[PDB]
């Protein structure tokens, strides 16, 4: 993928439960897999800010519940490092549901997003209210 523009310490693994920062009707997402990732023996697959992941809906509306969808990680509690040396961290871990074309399934994003996630997913960004 296109360089992210910052170094990331993945703060999530397969199985982690995160916030769905949108209005798709999904409230909580479970990480199932990480796009393009391949680990090593015994290593739990990890995902962090900027990765595209496959998720299952754990909490939300009946129609959304249990659906296996694609998403993009927009916030994480574990710090990331920007070119100027500063570390950046969020209040929670969150992702936004996305389609085949990486366009947000929802109409609105909830909460801030990392600028780096913009470079990658512009259409996701063109839905963000706050970009930090």
């Amino acid at each position: 993928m296109e360089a992210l523009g910052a170094d990331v310490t993945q703060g999530l693994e397969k199985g982690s439960l995160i916030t769905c920062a949108d209005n798709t009707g999904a409230r909580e997402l479970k990480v199932i897999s990480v796009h393009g990732y391949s680990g090593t023996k015994n290593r739990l697959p990890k995902a962090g800010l900027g990765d595209k992941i496959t998720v299952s809906v754990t909490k939300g509306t009946p129609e959304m519940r249990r659906q296996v969808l694609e998403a993009v990680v927009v916030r994480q509690r574990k710090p990331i490092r920007r070119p100027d040396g500063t570390r950046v961290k969020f209040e929670d871990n969150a992702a936004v549901i996305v389609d085949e074309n990486e366009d947000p399934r929802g109409t609105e994003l909830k909460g801030p997003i990392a600028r780096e996630v913009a470079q990658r997913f512009g259409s996701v960004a063109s839905a963000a209210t706050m970009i930090v």
């Binding site: 360089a3 523009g5 090593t40 023996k41 015994n42 070119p83 100027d84 040396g85």
Partner: protein, 337 residues
């Protein structure tokens, strides 16, 4: 089904024993290209700090922007090429033929060797030039040594001696180039060889850790879950199969870890100066203060503070040189805190 997995640790840096010479010894040298010139230099590690640099990379989306970069401060005072050794090619490889020494010696070079009192530089030179006429001359190298005394933070006064190859134009020309340096007094500096922005390979003897177990030394797993409470926590599963009925040298075991020579490739020289611009408030921890000739190396360098590190023009650079990077800031914030 027993999943695959690469083995633990590299088999390419063995045996993992205590280094024989604390002074690093390059086992390779740059190729002959430019004008004749000494292919290396040395200094003493002081510590680290960081600097803000203007992205120099012409292919980076950030070209021309502020960028914080880690730097290891190495004190690199002038050294003294004290002699010119000549190697001759033989059926059994390269062998020392003779050496051409000088008269002017640093006041304390006698703390390491028996300094010459009676030597014939012309007889030696004569034998060398005849070797060249015959076409039996191998490469040409300079016996070099440091001046620890010039570095206050380093307690040693005894000079560290190393042989550094001289490459360059034609042999005849670099032979003459070698002799010129030596004759003077051999005194040369970091500037004379490197330029800020070029890539250097740094060699040094890593920090010693004495005896350590397989987990730390080779990176094998610790025993997991229930297997961690029965009496075995940091011991590998087994030393090998029933057959072969012997333990292979490839199974990870305890032993000396650290204090090994390492040659780290493509280290970018961020800046070569002199003074106290890089020094840190309160002084570098366990080292002291810097106020003299110094070199800022991008990233990390093997070895503890005070150890002798060696520089050599990168023999396998991946990127082209982007000379004299613009340094907008050099942290002097205390390293204690």
């Amino acid at each position: 089904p027993q999943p695959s997995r690469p083995r633990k640790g590299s088999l390419g840096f063995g045996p993992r024993k205590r280094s024989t010479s604390e002074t690093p010894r390059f086992n390779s040298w740059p190729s002959d290209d430019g004008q004749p010139g000494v292919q290396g230099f040395a200094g003493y590690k002081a510590g680290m700090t960081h600097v803000v640099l203007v992205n120099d990379e012409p292919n980076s989306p950030r070209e021309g922007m502020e960028e914080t970069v880690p730097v290891t401060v190495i004190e690199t005072p002038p050294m003294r090429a004290v002699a010119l050794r000549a190697y001759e090619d033989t059926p059994y490889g390269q062998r020392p033929l003779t050496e051409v020494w000088t008269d002017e010696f640093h006041s304390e070079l006698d703390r390491t060797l028996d300094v010459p009192e009676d030597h014939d530089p012309d007889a030696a030179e004569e034998q060398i030039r005849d070797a060249h006429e015959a076409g039996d001359l191998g490469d040409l190298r300079l016996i070099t040594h440091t001046v620890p005394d010039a570095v206050p933070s380093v307690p040693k006064k005894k000079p560290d001696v190393m042989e550094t190859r001289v490459g360059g134009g034609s042999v005849s020309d670099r032979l003459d180039h070698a002799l010129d340096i030596v004759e003077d007094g051999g005194e040369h500096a970091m500037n004379d060889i490197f330029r800020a922005g070029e890539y250097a390979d740094v060699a040094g003897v890593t920090k010693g850790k004495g005896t350590q177990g397989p987990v730390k030394r080779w990176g094998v797993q610790k025993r997991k879950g229930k297997h961690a409470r029965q009496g075995w926590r940091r011991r590998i599963g087994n030393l090998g199969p029933w057959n072969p009925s012997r333990v292979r040298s490839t199974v990870p075991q305890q032993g000396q870890t650290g204090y090994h020579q390492r040659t780290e490739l493509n280290k970018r020289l961020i800046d070569i100066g002199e003074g106290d611009e890089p020094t840190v408030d309160g002084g570098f921890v366990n080292y002291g203060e810097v106020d003299g000739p110094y070199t800022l190396v991008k990233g990390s360098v093997p070895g503890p503070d005070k150890r002798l590190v060696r520089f050599r023009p990168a023999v396998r650079p991946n990127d082209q040189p982007r000379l004299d990077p613009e340094v907008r800031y050099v942290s002097n914030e205390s390293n204690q805190g």
